[PDB]
């Protein structure tokens, strides 16, 4: 896995150069933003389960895709969709701490689109569900970290199309 820092060094190591001038700053930038990341992370860890509840209610519940025939209909299906949303928040949050989308593309987005088109899971709806987590999350962690949580949230989305 890579983080903002390991990311910086790897790119400088491919060229053989010692830590560059611009490189030294990326490391600083990251270091300067460190706390707020850890701070935000703690918050979304405390609400993690509610930050899913609300999202579901705002986008997935009381609609065609829960009644008989909707691909979450079924006491097994419902639990499986929350299970996924739970994943998306736990990984979004890591990516945020790491200051790089590396885990997402590594242990998330690989072939996800496939199995989905494959099982019938509705892409458009799962994206709306997570898009809803952005709002709900941006409300408790703040605008600063929310914009930071947002980008990785939108990353998980673009990685399904």
């Amino acid at each position: 896995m890579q983080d903002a820092i390991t990311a910086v060094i790897n790119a400088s190591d491919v060229q053989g150069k010692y830590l560059d001038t611009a490189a030294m700053e990326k490391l600083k930038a990251y270091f300067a933003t460190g706390e707020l990341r850890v701070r935000a992370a703690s918050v979304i860890s405390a609400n993690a389960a509610n930050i899913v509840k609300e999202a579901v209610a705002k986008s997935l519940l009381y609609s065609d895709i829960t009644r008989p025939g909707g691909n979450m209909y079924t006491t097994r299906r419902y639990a499986a969709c929350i299970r996924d949303l739970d994943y998306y928040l736990r990984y979004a949050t890591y990516a945020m701490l790491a200051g790089d989308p590396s885990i997402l593309d590594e242990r998330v987005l690989n072939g996800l689109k496939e199995t989905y088109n494959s099982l019938g899971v509705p892409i458009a709806a799962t994206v709306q569900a997570i898009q809803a987590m952005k709002e709900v999350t941006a409300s408790l962690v703040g605008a600063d970290a929310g914009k930071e949580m947002g980008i990785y949230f939108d990353y998980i989305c673009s990685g399904l199309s």
């Binding site: 890579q2 983080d3 053989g16 270091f31 949050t93």
Partner: protein, 160 residues
Amino acid sequence: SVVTKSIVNADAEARYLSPGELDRIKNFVSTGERRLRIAQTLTENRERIVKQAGDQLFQKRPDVVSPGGNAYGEEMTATCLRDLDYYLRLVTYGIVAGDVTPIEEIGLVGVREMYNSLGTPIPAVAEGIRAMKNVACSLLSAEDAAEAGSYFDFVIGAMQ
């Protein structure tokens, strides 16, 4: 870093980072400014630190630089030093990261397999990195030296 080493461990137990881990990445980002200072200072003197450290080695192991030893003639010797600058660069990396992994993955995973093929003495290389740890440490403060010291010792210890 520890940010990276925490996430991994955490994903293995499928859970949000424990407060203790966060307590760590927190007090590690606070050590940053300094870390970079240390890397910066070594990277401005990388030129000299390798040269004298280079002499100090050729003195202790004249077999390296005479007939029949690996680094022979400006030809081979020139690359030997090169090898030593390679490792200085990897030290600044480990330092900035607060981790040793970058060194492992970049120049430790099979150093022996590589060098054996080239017939170069590893214990000799180990002394080449040791010497450096002293040249560089001389340019650092009492503490910036202890910590920077680790990354040099971890290498030599794998050189065996």
